[PDB]
From a paper:
The molecular chaperone [name], the bacterial homologue of Hsp104, is a disaggregation machine that provides thermotolerance by resolubilizing and reactivating aggregated proteins in concert with the DnaK (Hsp70) chaperone system. [name] belongs to the family of [name]+ proteins (ATPases associated with various cellular activities) that comprises a wide range of molecular machines which utilize the energy from ATP hydrolysis to remodel their respective substrates. The [name]+ disaggregation machines Hsp104 and [name] possess two NBDs per monomer, thus forming double-ring structures with 12 potential ATPase sites in the active hexameric complex. We determined high-resolution X-ray structures in different nucleotide states for one of the motor subunits, namely [name], of [name] and combined the structural analysis with nucleotide-binding kinetics studies.
Numbering used by the authors: 518 to 545, 549 to 642, 649 to 849
Write the structure that this text describes.
């Protein structure tokens, strides 16, 4: 039968059950890694860790009263931690709206617990958000910064797979994936390299600070601890391409194509990445170096509907040509 599709039947069941379409259609699962790599370049370990946890939960091998999976993502800023959480929410649960992000730098000071589970009588951000979306990826950023009382509420989710809010009713977390992140150790490494410490001292200092914040009792609850890597030059080039996709899409609406020389792509990659911020500068580099002078060319009619535009490097920056 060809007229009524899988998605039609999943959609009706989803609307009636609250179970996301992609969850109901999970099996119709082996490809999860390939799907995640559509958006996340490199960080293969992270992707496999996440996919393995999900496979174990689906195969009935894990505790049904704990979340689907829980991870700590260590390593530097701007190399894919958030992109993977987003991509995982969109993939498992059909939208990025299914990613709940919590910045622990906003939960350092004691009363912040109320902000999470609700003020004491006389609701909470998290508990309300998870009540209404039980199928969600929950991203806690900079977990070491959490006030201890906030830290303990996370431990309850890991241990119990649920929370009781201030109203005294349970909120279910058994269908969540928990991703914790921390930058710890990364500025210390750069500081060591700047001050010319020996590898020995750099390593010892990183281990000290990790031991200080993350104890076995905590770490043992997680499916995996993953250390994200810095990105290679090639990986940044592939990210540049991903970040040009929407621009190409808009250009193609006027049948304009963009043909970047290798030097051009490397020009954007070099400017759009650094050790401190990872690939976070890349978006505005593209905007300033490519989209703005291209806009000018189009508005002057030097670039026209149908044109194929070679983008190269000139002295002042990127240069544009049409054959
Ligand atoms: N591994 C990666 N794969 C694809 N895109 C990436 C990757 N790492 C970084 N990016 C891109 O650069 C940005 C990195 O910043 P962000 O997601 O804010 O990093 P963080 O995980 O530190 O929050 C993303 O918005 C994304 O477009």
């Amino acid at each position: 039968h060809m007229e009524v599709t899988e998605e039609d039947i999943a959609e009706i069941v989803s609307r009636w059950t609250g179970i996301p379409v992609s969850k109901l259609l999970e099996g119709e699962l082996l490809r999860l890694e390939e799907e995640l790599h559509k958006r996340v370049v490199g960080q293969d370990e992270a992707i496999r860790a996440v996919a393995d946890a999900i496979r174990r939960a689906r195969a009935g091998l894990k505790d049904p009263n704990r979340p689907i999976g829980s991870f700590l993502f260590l390593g530097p800023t701007g190399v894919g931690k958030t992109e993977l959480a987003k991509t995982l929410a969109a993939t498992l649960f059909d939208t990025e709206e299914a990613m709940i992000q919590i910045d622990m730098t906003e939960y350092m000071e004691k009363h912040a617990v109320s902000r999470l589970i609700g003020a004491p009588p006389g609701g909470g951000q998290l508990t309300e958000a998870v009540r209404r979306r039980p199928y969600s990826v929950i991203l806690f950023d900079e977990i070491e910064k959490a006030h201890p009382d906030v830290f303990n509420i996370l431990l309850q989710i890991l241990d119990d797979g649920r929370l009781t809010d201030s109203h005294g009713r349970t909120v279910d977390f058994r269908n969540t994936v928990i991703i914790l992140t921390s930058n710890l150790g990364s500025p210390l490494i750069l500081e060591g390299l700047q001050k010319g410490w020996p590898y020995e001292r750099i390593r010892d200092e990183v281990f000290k600070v990790l031991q200080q914040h993350f104890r076995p009792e905590f770490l043992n609850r997680l499916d995996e601890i993953v250390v994200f890597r810095p990105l290679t030059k090639e990986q940044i080039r592939q990210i540049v391409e991903i970040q040009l996709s929407y621009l190409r899409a808009r250009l193609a609406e006027k049948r304009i194509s963009l043909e970047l020389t290798e030097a051009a792509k490397d020009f954007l990659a070099e400017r759009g990445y650094d050790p401190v911020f990872g690939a976070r500068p890349l978006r505005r580099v593209i905007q300033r170096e490519l989209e703005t002078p291209l806009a000018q060319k189009i508005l002057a009619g030097e670039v026209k509907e149908g044109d194929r535009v070679q983008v190269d490097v000139g002295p002042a920056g990127l240069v544009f040509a049409v054959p």
